[PDB]
Amino acid sequence: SMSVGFIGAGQLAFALAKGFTAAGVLAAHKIMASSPDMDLATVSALRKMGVKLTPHNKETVQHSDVLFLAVKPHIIPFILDEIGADIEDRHIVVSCAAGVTISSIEKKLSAFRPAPRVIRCMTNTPVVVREGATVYATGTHAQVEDGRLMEQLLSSVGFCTEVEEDLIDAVTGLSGSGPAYAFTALDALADGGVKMGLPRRLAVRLGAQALLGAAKMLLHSEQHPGQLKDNVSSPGGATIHALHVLESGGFRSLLINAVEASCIRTRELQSMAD
Amino acid sequence: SMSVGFIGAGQLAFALAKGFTAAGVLAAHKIMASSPDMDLATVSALRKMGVKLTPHNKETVQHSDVLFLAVKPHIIPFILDEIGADIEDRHIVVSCAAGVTISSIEKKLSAFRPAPRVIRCMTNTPVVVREGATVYATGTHAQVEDGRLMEQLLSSVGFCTEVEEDLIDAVTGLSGSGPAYAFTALDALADGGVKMGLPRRLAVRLGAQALLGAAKMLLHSEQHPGQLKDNVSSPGGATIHALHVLESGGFRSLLINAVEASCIRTRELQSMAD
Amino acid sequence: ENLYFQSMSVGFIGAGQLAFALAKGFTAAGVLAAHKIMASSPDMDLATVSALRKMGVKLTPHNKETVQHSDVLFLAVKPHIIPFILDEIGADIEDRHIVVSCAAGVTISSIEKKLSAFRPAPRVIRCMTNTPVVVREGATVYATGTHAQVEDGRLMEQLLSSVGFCTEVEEDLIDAVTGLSGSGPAYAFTALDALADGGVKMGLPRRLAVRLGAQALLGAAKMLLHSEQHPGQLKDNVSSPGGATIHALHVLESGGFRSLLINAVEASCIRTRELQSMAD
Amino acid sequence: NLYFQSMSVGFIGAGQLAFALAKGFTAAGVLAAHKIMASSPDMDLATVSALRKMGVKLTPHNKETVQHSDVLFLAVKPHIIPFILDEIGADIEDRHIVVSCAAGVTISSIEKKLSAFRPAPRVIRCMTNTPVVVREGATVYATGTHAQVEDGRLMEQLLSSVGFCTEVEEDLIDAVTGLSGSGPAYAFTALDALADGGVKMGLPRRLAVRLGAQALLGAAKMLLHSEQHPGQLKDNVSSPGGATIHALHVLESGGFRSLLINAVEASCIRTRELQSMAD
Amino acid sequence: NLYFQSMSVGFIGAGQLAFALAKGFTAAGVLAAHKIMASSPDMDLATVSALRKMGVKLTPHNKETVQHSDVLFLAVKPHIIPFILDEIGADIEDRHIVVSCAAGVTISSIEKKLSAFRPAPRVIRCMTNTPVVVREGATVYATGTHAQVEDGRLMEQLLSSVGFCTEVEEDLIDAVTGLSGSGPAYAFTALDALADGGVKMGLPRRLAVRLGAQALLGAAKMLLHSEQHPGQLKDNVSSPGGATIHALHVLESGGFRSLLINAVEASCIRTRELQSMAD
Ligand SMILES: O=C(O)[C@@H]1CS[C@@]2(c3ccccc3)CCC(=O)N12
Ligand SMILES: O=C(O)[C@@H]1CS[C@@]2(c3ccccc3)CCC(=O)N12
């Protein structure tokens, strides 16, 4: 019974739209999206799925109750300055642009109507398989039900919890960038499998199934990841030999470095927005 | 309508038993397990689940149609030399000991009855959440239906495919050791999340959800993991900055090193069995 | 208590660091009188011999005298000296003796073959211990030999439990145990010297920096021994988000700190196997 | 045989430090659990859940803690401090000793905030660690401008009951944080790694954890009880050509010492930043 | 304007190399697709599926390929070779030229296996790469004991139609494998990394891949067409103080050159091992 709109019809808009429609919380036709390049693969794919597509952001705003902002962070202040006169009391504006603060969206839109309902959101592509990791912060004028509607909607395509907005730059470095860390990891493990004699197809399937299963084990365990590592590593065995070589390369510090660098870049993108 | 037995009641026996019973392919009472330390956490846990527990490996052999060998590779030739007179025509002997070849099991058991039906198996702990990665090779006397019964049984707790036996040492390095690589990875990402300001609980949940989701994306995509990495990495963005720092530490080579080292150790354990 | 009234006579062949540590520990525990202990060395000019002499331990340059005095006979010499000792005193081992080898890596099998040429059932126990027995906080393991009676392992556990932790292991674990708890205190002394340098770099007086670093190590170890929790779970509990600790942990990770300790256990274990393999 | 029959203790914050100190104080018998009260904003914390079992009084209102307490521990994150002081600052009284455990938060900043309500607040800055839960903590404290002489002596008496405790100049606390405050986390990492080492060479995990922890425990005790340099204790274990000296070489080859120096330095520098990026 | 009107080609193996060469040969117009036949044990291979679309004749029986072919490419893994030769060795005839593309497999080993059936088998060893699919392959070949002079000339003519091709002594083929045989994979890695570089600095991914590939393409063409040392071409781009020379410094600081040397060396040494661990 809700109308959803996407400004930007790229990778994130499609993932969210595909996830929502797959989840059954939203029918594809209750979704409208608009993009600048009106002939992109994501925009055509939305058409086959049943999403209404348009090149006019104003038409998208006019149709939606909940309006997702799915554009690069530097496009954001132009979208708000271009569509701000079109926001109404009914609108919930959900920003997904990396680093863009609730403050700037609220300051830009307040020039038009004084109590914009803004929610900042950080999600990732696996919403397309309904296994996303999502956090959101509610803005100054976001009503109580607004956070609940947001939590209800995004929980249908993965994990979702509210955070203080000052955690979102860090969450970006962990679960926002996370899937790319996993994709790099899977390509390399596949190279390893292939070096040791496995066909590439089998190596990719096995490496992925292992991560999927391991992550699920942690999610279902009350136990520390180190204790699971302990549980798996038989004395003198193959696994403990492999863990040693990871440690010798500082494997842990590399992933720590990555979360930090992604978080810090997100702060740089936010600080260059002001 | 099948009777299953486990020799060894440790981590792998429990994971498989818990997975099978959770999957509904096997009732807990159609499973019997035996262990040396008859007062271990895994042995007590099997009791609460409904698995029959015993300290006599002979009683386990007498009850089972399918008999899982879930012991360390050096215990294997003593188990076979101790229980070999008890194998019958009905028995399917499924070895899970790392590195132990079908040849040695067939040579040890042939001293008792001449056509032992042996299947070598490589699996991992996530069968406990029915997301295991399993491969198996059928032995000299394994009938046609034997591979099918094996594939049917282990597919119910995760992925399962037949391989040539000479791939299993490599598969061990990839999906056998895989979950421990993931557990180390999740602990470090959690350290990273925590360094950048996230609560530890939230960082573990987000890091795990990200891996679960990313792995599922790869499993459901026809696309190369590099193309998914490309799809996720917006120009100038946080993710591409994080991927750079991974590359600078040779992140890929570390995971390649790990699969290789686990595979090579598995060959060493097999070569020390002979 | 029962070992005191057991009125045991102990001998050490070799009067080096380990003999002194165990003698110091035993006497500190009250299980043994210092004069009911006899030790022997070919060089009477070590400080360890002076400390034993000052303690009241009986000292002699003749190993046979140490064998004749002993009920429990500790072999505390470098792994290559072992077969020359066994050849020299092997005729003197008696049925009453419990022979406890403390040499790194030297197998029970090798000791039994040497001694079986003299008496058919030598009672042999192999031991791996460490210097903190001197403050009764040692880490000790032992494996019982072919002819060790059940009471021999029980007496051994009681004697060594009085100076720290003690448990029986299968013998094929002792090499790994050497690399972990036998060499362990040296890793810790190195770590404490360095943490103290860290303190001094950041402005602490040296005495204070040494004191605090050791107390922290002691307290963390004690927390682990008393906790049912994984050491990583303890790590999380102290590491507040954005905090000082998590920043310090990061730079540890960036140097491969974990892999250095793994390398250390491994190299010590491998060297131990080499020391016996060079006794072939 | 020490016991503070007329002292009331309160904790602002019901996290890790509050629980460790309360468990330590009660373990020592110096304080009854019912004479201790704690407060938290998340009454669904694992530590706050645990505090209920020991018998410590729990409340969600910091004012209730301040009102029931003589000695008030501030066990909150350093950024929470200036909001906490604003909430209860009007409730501080002459009897109160305010003991800050927040990393980096200076005596000056607490005194300036509290002086706005009543002049001469009695403030003591403290740096402690989690092993107070097993009464082997390392604690230092610096006394504020208005803390009487009996104020530090009482705190030393209380904190000596859960481990080592000494007074230091306040400008040592940032470095002490990097050494003994963060110290236990370096040790937990070390014990995990050593146990991985043991497991690689064939030890059961349980045994490897036990032996590694016992070795660290024992060596630390040897150092505390010896008058000798840690290098001299190092020498005693390192028999010529032996197993230990080979392992020491590979530690040296990786710069093991410098890693531990880097860690203390990094924890102290972060502590300075948290203080300076507050003020 | 070249065309082998009386030649029949067969592939044992329907994998990557079979498909690349067949696509290349047909792209050049030198061979009609229906005059080409391939065989595979997995008739559900992506490449074997692709071969059907081009019109190449497909069969699961290696004997059928041998019987229909004049020139027979062995496009199988080096361990499959001695079992393949055992299956069709009795089917080799005087008209046959057997061209091995298996890495490391020596002319000697193929000739010894095939001489057991008919003496004087005509054998040519070949090392090629996947860019033959765009007619820019690098191919070398060594002729066997019984290959007539016209045998190598015919092969050079055929393989020159899909890229560079020259005859070498057989003991160069292991190194050529490490240079040009593995060469394209190093380049694909390089282009992925360069595109990551472009994307980091703000380029769209599509554009970064296009520009990176074009730069590699163009530089390679410059080298092939220039009489000058690659260092001299390097100098021409590196204006004093400029952007390029700063980037060259960071390549040097990571030992970029030595990595590419390590790679050729490692691929050649593995190739030697695969040959020696067969025989
Ligand atoms: O010397 C060594 O490297 C190792 C490490 S522990 C042990 C030792 C214990 C106590 C004091 C001195 C040495 C037992 C004998 C031996 O070889 N050890
Ligand atoms: O000099 C350089 O590092 C860069 C790299 S490309 C360009 C160049 C193109 C062709 C020949 C020489 C230089 C354009 C001018 C300039 O500055 N360039």
Side-chain angles (χ1 to χ4, degrees), chain A residues 4-10 12-29 31-34 36-37 40-41 44-46 49-52 54-57 60-61 63-71 73-74 77-78 80-81 84-88 90-106 109-112 114-142 146-147 149-151 153-221 223-269 271-274, chain B residues 4-10 12-29 31-34 36-37 40-41 44-46 49-52 54-57 60-61 63-71 73-74 77-78 80-81 84-88 90-106 109-112 114-142 146-147 149-151 153-221 223-269 271-274, chain C residues 3-4 8-44 46-53 55-77 79-112 114-148 152-153 155-227 229-279, chain D residues 1-4 7-34 36-41 46 50-51 55-76 78-79 81-111 113-147 151-152 154-226 228-274 276-279, chain E residues 1-4 7-34 36-41 46 50-51 55-76 78-79 81-111 113-147 151-152 154-226 228-274 276-279:
Chain A
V4 170
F6 286 85
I7 293 172
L12 197 109
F14 165 80
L16 283 175
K18 167 135 186 186
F20 289 152
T21 54
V25 289
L26 231 39
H29 68 81
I31 299 159
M32 173 171 322
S34 57
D37 214 316
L40 233 157
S44 42
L46 287 161
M49 226 186 329
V51 177
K52 315 158 145 165
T54 175
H56 302 329
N57 298 323
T60 310
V61 173
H63 136 96
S64 70
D65 303 313
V66 177
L67 179 63
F68 289 91
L69 311 185
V71 297
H74 51 45
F78 299 78
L80 296 181
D81 284 323
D86 297 301
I87 300 308
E88 295 195 358
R90 77 181 190 264
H91 278 133
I92 302 172
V93 178
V94 182
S95 167
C96 297
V100 175
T101 74
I102 294 183
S103 175
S104 86
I105 302 156
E106 284 184 347
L109 294 176
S110 282
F112 300 100
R117 305 152 67 188
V118 175
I119 289 164
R120 183 172 174 190
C121 174
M122 170 44 51
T123 183
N124 54 17
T125 57
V127 296
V128 78
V129 289
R130 301 177 59 244
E131 288 296 348
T134 307
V135 305
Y136 66 92
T138 57
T140 315
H141 314 286
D146 291 329
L149 178 150
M150 219 36 57
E151 176 134 1
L153 182 61
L154 283 298
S155 281
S156 77
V157 297
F159 174 75
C160 180
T161 196
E162 182 180 0
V163 300
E164 284 295 310
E165 186 184 0
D166 61 345
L167 299 189
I168 285 171
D169 296 342
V171 163
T172 297
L174 176 53
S175 46
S177 290
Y181 313 160
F183 297 140
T184 304
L186 289 157
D187 194 28
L189 286 161
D191 284 342
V194 168
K195 187 194 189 181
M196 302 319 293
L198 297 184
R200 168 72 58 168
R201 187 180 162 87
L202 183 65
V204 172
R205 181 70 147 96
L206 289 178
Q209 184 59 43
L211 272 50
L212 190 139
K216 190 177 190 201
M217 268 189 87
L218 202 38
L219 292 174
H220 286 46
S221 181
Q223 303 180 104
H224 195 279
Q227 189 63 258
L228 294 192
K229 176 270 283 161
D230 290 8
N231 291 351
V232 146
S233 304
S234 56
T239 304
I240 190 59
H241 281 73
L243 294 172
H244 192 187
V245 308
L246 291 178
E247 299 290 359
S248 278
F251 174 77
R252 291 164 177 274
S253 75
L254 296 196
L255 298 163
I256 295 170
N257 289 346
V259 177
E260 177 179 49
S262 168
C263 177
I264 287 170
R265 178 64 178 168
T266 291
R267 298 173 185 168
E268 269 171 21
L269 298 175
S271 304
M272 287 163 196
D274 316 327
Chain B
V4 170
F6 286 85
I7 293 172
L12 197 109
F14 165 80
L16 283 175
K18 167 135 186 186
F20 289 152
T21 54
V25 289
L26 231 39
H29 68 81
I31 299 159
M32 173 171 322
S34 57
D37 214 316
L40 233 157
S44 42
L46 287 161
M49 226 186 329
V51 177
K52 315 158 145 165
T54 175
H56 302 329
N57 298 323
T60 310
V61 173
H63 136 96
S64 70
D65 303 313
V66 177
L67 179 63
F68 289 91
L69 311 185
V71 297
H74 51 45
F78 299 78
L80 296 181
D81 284 323
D86 297 301
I87 300 308
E88 295 195 358
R90 77 181 190 264
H91 278 133
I92 302 172
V93 178
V94 182
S95 167
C96 297
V100 175
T101 74
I102 294 183
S103 175
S104 86
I105 302 156
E106 284 184 347
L109 294 176
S110 282
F112 300 100
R117 305 152 67 188
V118 175
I119 289 164
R120 183 172 174 190
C121 174
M122 170 44 51
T123 183
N124 54 17
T125 57
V127 296
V128 78
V129 289
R130 301 177 59 244
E131 288 296 348
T134 307
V135 305
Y136 66 92
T138 57
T140 315
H141 314 286
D146 291 329
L149 178 150
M150 219 36 57
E151 176 134 1
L153 182 61
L154 283 298
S155 281
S156 77
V157 297
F159 174 75
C160 180
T161 196
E162 182 180 0
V163 300
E164 284 295 310
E165 186 184 0
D166 61 345
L167 299 189
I168 285 171
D169 296 342
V171 163
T172 297
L174 176 53
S175 46
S177 290
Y181 313 160
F183 297 140
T184 304
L186 289 157
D187 194 28
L189 286 161
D191 284 342
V194 168
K195 187 194 189 181
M196 302 319 293
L198 297 184
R200 168 72 58 168
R201 187 180 162 87
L202 183 65
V204 172
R205 181 70 147 96
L206 289 178
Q209 184 59 43
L211 272 50
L212 190 139
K216 190 177 190 201
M217 268 189 87
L218 202 38
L219 292 174
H220 286 46
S221 181
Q223 303 180 104
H224 195 279
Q227 189 63 258
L228 294 192
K229 176 270 283 161
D230 290 8
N231 291 351
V232 146
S233 304
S234 56
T239 304
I240 190 59
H241 281 73
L243 294 172
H244 192 187
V245 308
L246 291 178
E247 299 290 359
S248 278
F251 174 77
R252 291 164 177 274
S253 75
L254 296 196
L255 298 163
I256 295 170
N257 289 346
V259 177
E260 177 179 49
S262 168
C263 177
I264 287 170
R265 178 64 178 168
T266 291
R267 298 173 185 168
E268 269 171 21
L269 298 175
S271 304
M272 287 163 196
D274 316 327
Chain C
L3 283 142
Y4 179 81
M8 275 198 317
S9 294
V10 170
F12 291 103
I13 289 171
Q17 293 288 337
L18 182 54
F20 166 76
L22 282 175
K24 188 67 187 286
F26 289 146
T27 49
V31 310
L32 235 38
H35 57 265
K36 285 286 285 185
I37 295 162
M38 176 170 321
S40 55
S41 155
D43 186 15
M44 292 303 147
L46 325 166
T48 44
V49 157
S50 291
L52 289 164
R53 186 161 231 114
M55 267 181 46
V57 157
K58 274 152 61 178
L59 297 167
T60 173
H62 303 322
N63 295 320
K64 153 192 242 180
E65 274 163 355
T66 309
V67 173
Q68 287 184 332
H69 155 80
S70 293
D71 307 318
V72 173
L73 182 66
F74 288 94
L75 310 186
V77 289
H80 59 287
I81 305 302
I82 293 294
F84 298 104
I85 290 319
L86 294 183
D87 280 323
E88 167 207 27
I89 52 87
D92 298 302
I93 303 302
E94 301 180 54
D95 295 355
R96 67 186 180 80
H97 276 125
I98 304 171
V99 173
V100 182
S101 172
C102 295
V106 175
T107 70
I108 290 183
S109 177
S110 85
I111 303 157
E112 288 183 352
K114 280 276 185 187
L115 297 180
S116 282
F118 301 101
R119 283 295 294 152
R123 302 150 65 186
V124 177
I125 288 165
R126 180 174 169 192
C127 173
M128 175 45 52
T129 185
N130 54 14
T131 54
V133 296
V134 82
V135 291
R136 303 183 64 196
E137 285 296 347
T140 302
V141 304
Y142 68 94
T144 56
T146 316
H147 314 289
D152 293 330
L155 177 150
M156 204 43 38
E157 176 132 3
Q158 307 173 22
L159 180 60
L160 287 150
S161 282
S162 77
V163 292
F165 175 76
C166 178
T167 193
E168 183 185 0
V169 299
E170 294 302 309
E171 188 186 1
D172 64 356
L173 305 188
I174 286 172
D175 299 343
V177 166
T178 307
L180 178 52
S181 49
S183 283
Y187 314 158
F189 297 141
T190 300
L192 289 161
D193 194 25
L195 287 158
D197 285 343
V200 171
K201 187 192 187 180
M202 302 315 289
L204 298 183
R206 166 71 57 172
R207 153 146 190 85
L208 184 64
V210 173
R211 184 72 160 93
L212 289 174
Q215 185 63 43
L217 224 124
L218 192 140
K222 193 182 192 220
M223 269 190 86
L224 198 32
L225 293 170
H226 285 47
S227 182
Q229 304 242 100
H230 193 280
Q233 190 55 255
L234 295 190
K235 176 205 98 223
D236 294 5
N237 295 356
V238 290
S239 301
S240 51
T245 306
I246 194 65
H247 280 72
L249 290 175
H250 190 187
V251 310
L252 293 177
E253 296 287 353
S254 282
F257 172 75
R258 290 160 175 273
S259 78
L260 296 196
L261 299 162
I262 303 167
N263 294 345
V265 172
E266 176 183 48
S268 168
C269 177
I270 287 173
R271 180 66 178 169
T272 291
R273 297 171 181 168
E274 192 164 79
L275 294 173
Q276 160 73 10
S277 308
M278 281 172 188
Chain D
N1 277 337
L2 166 162
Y3 180 87
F4 310 105
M7 181 193 299
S8 170
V9 174
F11 289 89
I12 296 284
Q16 277 281 319
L17 228 60
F19 172 81
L21 282 175
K23 179 54 164 66
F25 289 149
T26 50
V30 317
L31 278 164
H34 69 271
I36 296 161
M37 176 173 305
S39 56
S40 157
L51 287 163
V56 165
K57 294 184 72 184
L58 277 314
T59 174
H61 306 129
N62 291 318
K63 293 172 175 189
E64 276 194 15
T65 309
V66 170
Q67 291 190 26
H68 133 288
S69 292
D70 303 316
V71 177
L72 181 65
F73 286 91
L74 310 188
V76 297
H79 54 285
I81 282 279
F83 298 89
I84 282 292
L85 295 182
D86 282 358
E87 177 204 2
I88 39 78
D91 296 302
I92 298 303
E93 300 199 321
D94 298 329
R95 76 182 189 267
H96 279 132
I97 302 173
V98 177
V99 181
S100 169
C101 297
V105 175
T106 98
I107 294 183
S108 180
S109 87
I110 300 157
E111 285 183 348
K113 270 281 183 197
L114 292 178
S115 283
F117 298 95
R118 186 184 312 268
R122 304 155 67 186
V123 177
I124 287 164
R125 185 173 174 191
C126 171
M127 171 45 51
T128 186
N129 54 16
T130 54
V132 296
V133 80
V134 292
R135 303 180 63 202
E136 288 292 346
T139 301
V140 300
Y141 68 94
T143 57
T145 313
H146 315 288
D151 287 326
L154 179 66
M155 283 321 130
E156 174 136 1
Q157 219 183 341
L158 178 60
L159 284 152
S160 280
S161 78
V162 292
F164 174 76
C165 177
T166 194
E167 181 184 359
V168 304
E169 289 302 310
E170 184 184 356
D171 65 352
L172 304 185
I173 285 174
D174 301 340
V176 164
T177 302
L179 177 56
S180 51
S182 286
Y186 314 153
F188 299 139
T189 301
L191 292 157
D192 195 24
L194 285 161
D196 282 343
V199 171
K200 186 191 184 181
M201 304 316 287
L203 299 185
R205 166 71 59 173
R206 212 196 193 280
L207 182 63
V209 173
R210 180 70 166 92
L211 289 177
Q214 189 62 41
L216 283 201
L217 189 104
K221 192 179 190 202
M222 269 188 84
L223 198 31
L224 291 168
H225 286 240
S226 182
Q228 302 185 303
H229 198 282
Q232 192 61 73
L233 298 191
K234 176 203 98 223
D235 289 0
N236 290 347
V237 199
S238 302
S239 52
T244 304
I245 196 65
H246 281 77
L248 292 174
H249 194 185
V250 308
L251 293 178
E252 297 289 354
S253 281
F256 175 78
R257 291 161 178 273
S258 74
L259 294 194
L260 295 162
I261 301 168
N262 292 346
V264 176
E265 177 183 48
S267 169
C268 176
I269 287 174
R270 179 62 175 165
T271 287
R272 294 173 181 168
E273 269 168 15
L274 297 174
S276 305
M277 74 192 359
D279 308 329
Chain E
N1 277 337
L2 166 162
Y3 180 87
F4 310 105
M7 181 193 299
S8 170
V9 174
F11 289 89
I12 296 284
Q16 277 281 319
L17 228 60
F19 172 81
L21 282 175
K23 179 54 164 66
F25 289 149
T26 50
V30 317
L31 278 164
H34 69 271
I36 296 161
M37 176 173 305
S39 56
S40 157
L51 287 163
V56 165
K57 294 184 72 184
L58 277 314
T59 174
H61 306 129
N62 291 318
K63 293 172 175 189
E64 276 194 15
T65 309
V66 170
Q67 291 190 26
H68 133 288
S69 292
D70 303 316
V71 177
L72 181 65
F73 286 91
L74 310 188
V76 297
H79 54 285
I81 282 279
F83 298 89
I84 282 292
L85 295 182
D86 282 358
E87 177 204 2
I88 39 78
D91 296 302
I92 298 303
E93 300 199 321
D94 298 329
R95 76 182 189 267
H96 279 132
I97 302 173
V98 177
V99 181
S100 169
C101 297
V105 175
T106 98
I107 294 183
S108 180
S109 87
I110 300 157
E111 285 183 348
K113 270 281 183 197
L114 292 178
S115 283
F117 298 95
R118 186 184 312 268
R122 304 155 67 186
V123 177
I124 287 164
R125 185 173 174 191
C126 171
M127 171 45 51
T128 186
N129 54 16
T130 54
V132 296
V133 80
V134 292
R135 303 180 63 202
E136 288 292 346
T139 301
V140 300
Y141 68 94
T143 57
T145 313
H146 315 288
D151 287 326
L154 179 66
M155 283 321 130
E156 174 136 1
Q157 219 183 341
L158 178 60
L159 284 152
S160 280
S161 78
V162 292
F164 174 76
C165 177
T166 194
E167 181 184 359
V168 304
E169 289 302 310
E170 184 184 356
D171 65 352
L172 304 185
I173 285 174
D174 301 340
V176 164
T177 302
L179 177 56
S180 51
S182 286
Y186 314 153
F188 299 139
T189 301
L191 292 157
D192 195 24
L194 285 161
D196 282 343
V199 171
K200 186 191 184 181
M201 304 316 287
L203 299 185
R205 166 71 59 173
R206 212 196 193 280
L207 182 63
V209 173
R210 180 70 166 92
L211 289 177
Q214 189 62 41
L216 283 201
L217 189 104
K221 192 179 190 202
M222 269 188 84
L223 198 31
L224 291 168
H225 286 240
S226 182
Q228 302 185 303
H229 198 282
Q232 192 61 73
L233 298 191
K234 176 203 98 223
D235 289 0
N236 290 347
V237 199
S238 302
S239 52
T244 304
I245 196 65
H246 281 77
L248 292 174
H249 194 185
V250 308
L251 293 178
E252 297 289 354
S253 281
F256 175 78
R257 291 161 178 273
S258 74
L259 294 194
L260 295 162
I261 301 168
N262 292 346
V264 176
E265 177 183 48
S267 169
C268 176
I269 287 174
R270 179 62 175 165
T271 287
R272 294 173 181 168
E273 269 168 15
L274 297 174
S276 305
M277 74 192 359
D279 308 329

